[PDB]
């Protein structure tokens, strides 16, 4: 239920289709003559949508009860802070943190000084920084689902859905240098097998 769009819409469909080759390191690369900021912006939006729906499938198993903290494994714990509303990181539940996190990413996506909808308006000079912060924070949603909820992911059959979207995610951030090794440490074991 949606349909015809341009020009970043062809880019999104371009990226979605080219994954069908199964070689994700090639289909992740910047198409010839395409704006780097727009290619990352287009995929960052799609990643946000994908992980929003992946987490939405398991949302009944992630509660204030079974997830009092944001966790990827026992070793890693996330406390939420952004710019101003919350400066010092605050300890909260995994459902509430992801709500903070996804509502925050939406706010950047709806900021036209950041993600301009007019096709002729340059992305800001700091756009690369803003996109790195988005993707590094969305990765943590993969990490929490994999460590805590993977059993629910297999009760539903989303495991192919999640692993294909996660493989696409890692190969994309790796191609463009979008996330530090220190941030991918929780899934590092899975990352090395992919």
């Amino acid at each position: 239920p949606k349909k015809n769009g341009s020009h970043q819409y062809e880019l999104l469909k371009h990226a979605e289709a080219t994954l069908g080759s199964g070689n994700l390191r090639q289909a992740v690369m910047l198409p010839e003559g395409e704006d780097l900021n727009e290619w990352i912006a287009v995929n960052t939006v799609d990643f946000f949508n994908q992980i929003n729906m992946l987490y939405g499938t398991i949302t009944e198993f992630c509660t204030e009860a079974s997830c009092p903290v944001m966790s990827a494994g026992p070793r890693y714990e996330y406390h939420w802070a952004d710019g101003t509303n919350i400066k010092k990181p605050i300890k909260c539940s995994a459902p509430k943190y992801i709500d903070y996190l996804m509502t925050w990413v939406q706010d950047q996506l709806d900021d036209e000084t950041l993600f301009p909808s007019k096709i002729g308006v340059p992305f800001p000079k700091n756009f690369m920084s803003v996109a790195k912060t988005i993707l590094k924070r969305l990765f943590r949603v993969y990490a929490h689902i994999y460590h805590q909820h993977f059993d629910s992911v297999m009760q539903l059959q989303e495991e192919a859905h999640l692993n294909t979207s996660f493989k696409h995610f890692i190969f994309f951030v790796q191609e463009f240098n979008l996330i530090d090794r220190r941030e991918l440490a929780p899934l590092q074991e899975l990352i090395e097998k992919l």
Binding site: P74, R75, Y76, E77, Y78, H79, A81, P89, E183
Partner: peptide, 5 residues
């Protein structure tokens, strides 16, 4: 924002 044990 990110704490480790």
């Amino acid at each position: 924002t990110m704490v480790i044990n």
